[PDB]
């Protein structure tokens, strides 16, 4: 309902490219997303560390 709201990518949405944790909508795509336009505070940091997400 909040934060978590995607599972593909910021711009290149094909098949979840960001395995980053999923509590802060960070399942976008490690390469073009960084709280720049998906719903996160300049996250760009804990990308490699994720909690309960799908990953790739
Ligand atoms: Zn992308
Ligand atoms: Zn985030």
From Swiss-Prot:
Modification(s) after translation: Ubiquitinated; mediated by RNF4, RNF111, UHRF1, UBE3A/E6AP, BCR(KLHL20) E3 ubiquitin ligase complex E3 ligase complex, SIAH1 or SIAH2 and leading to subsequent proteasomal degradation.
Record's note on what induces expression: By interferons alpha, beta and gamma. Up-regulated by IRF3 and p53/TP53.
Binding positions for Zn(2+) 2 per the UniProt entry: 24, 26, 40, 43
Impact reported for residue 41 to R: No nuclear microspeckle location, no sumoylation and loss of intrinsic transcriptional repressor activity of PML-RARA oncoprotein
Covalent link Glycyl lysine isopeptide (Lys-Gly) (interchain with G-Cter in SUMO1), residues: 17
Reported impact of residue 20 to R: No effect on sumoylation levels
Stated consequence of mutating residue 9 to S: Strongly reduced sumoylation
Disease (UniProt): A chromosomal aberration involving PML may be a cause of acute promyelocytic leukemia (APL). Translocation t(15;17)(q21;q21) with RARA. The PML breakpoints (type A and type B) lie on either side of an alternatively spliced exon.
Domain-level remarks: The coiled-coil domain mediates a strong homo/multidimerization activity essential for core assembly of PML-NBs. Interacts with PKM via its coiled-coil domain.
General function of this protein: Functions via its association with PML-nuclear bodies (PML-NBs) in a wide range of important cellular processes, including tumor suppression, transcriptional regulation, apoptosis, senescence, DNA damage response, and viral defense mechanisms. Acts as the scaffold of PML-NBs allowing other proteins to shuttle in and out, a process which is regulated by SUMO-mediated modifications and interactions. Inhibits EIF4E-mediated mRNA nuclear export by reducing EIF4E affinity for the 5' 7-methylguanosine (m7G) cap of target mRNAs. Exhibits antiviral activity against both DNA and RNA viruses. The antiviral activity can involve one or several isoform(s) and can be enhanced by the permanent PML-NB-associated protein DAXX or by the recruitment of p53/TP53 within these structures. Isoform PML-4 restricts varicella zoster virus (VZV) via sequestration of virion capsids in PML-NBs thereby preventing their nuclear egress and inhibiting formation of infectious virus particles. The sumoylated isoform PML-4 restricts rabies virus by inhibiting viral mRNA and protein synthesis.
Protein name: Protein PML
Name of the gene: PML
